[PDB]
Amino acid sequence: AKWSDSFDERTSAAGFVELGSNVVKLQDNDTLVGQIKYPTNGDGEVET
Amino acid sequence: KDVVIDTAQHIEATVPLEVIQDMKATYDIDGVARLSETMSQLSSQKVD
């Protein structure tokens, strides 16, 4: 997924987050809830 | 934590009578056997 202030860790610009260990799934046949912490900046390691 | 079992891919093979007859006549290879084991050893290699 990609936010509007995101950081890639793959490139070093505003890109997608290759999110792992928080991949969201079909919980009971329709629900798709998820609590995601994405890295805002790689240098100062800020996250949101 | 939840476990969901997917539906799988259909490994299929057509058996025409215009194909199984002559290919068993000339080269004496089987149609219902060489395609069944090809299917069985493709789906067996697909899991690993």
What does B9-36 look like in DSSP terms, one character per residue? --------HHHHTHHHHSS---HHHHHH
The angle formed by the CA atoms of residues A37, A40 and A42, to the nearest 5 degrees, is 110
For B2, the closest chain A residue by CA position comes to A27
Closest CA to B6 of B47, B41, B45: B47
Q: Which residues, 6+ apart, have CB-to-CB distance to B35 below 8 Å?
A: B13, B15
Q: What is the spatial distance between Cα A31 and Cα B31, in angstroms, rounded to a whole number?
A: 47
Closest CA to B3 of A33, A31, A27, A22: A27
B4 in A contact zone (CB under 8 Å): yes
The H or E element that residue B15 is part of is none
What experimental approach yielded this model? cryo-EM
Q: What is the spatial distance between Cα A13 and Cα A4, in angstroms, rounded to a whole number?
A: 11
- Tokens matching residue A23: 């991949």
Residue with tokens 């997608």: A16
- Work out the minimum CA distance from A37 to partner chain B, whole angstroms: 20
Q: What is the spatial distance between Cα A18 and Cα A39, in angstroms, rounded to a whole number?
A: 10
Q: What is the spatial distance between Cα B32 and Cα B18, in angstroms, rounded to a whole number?
A: 13
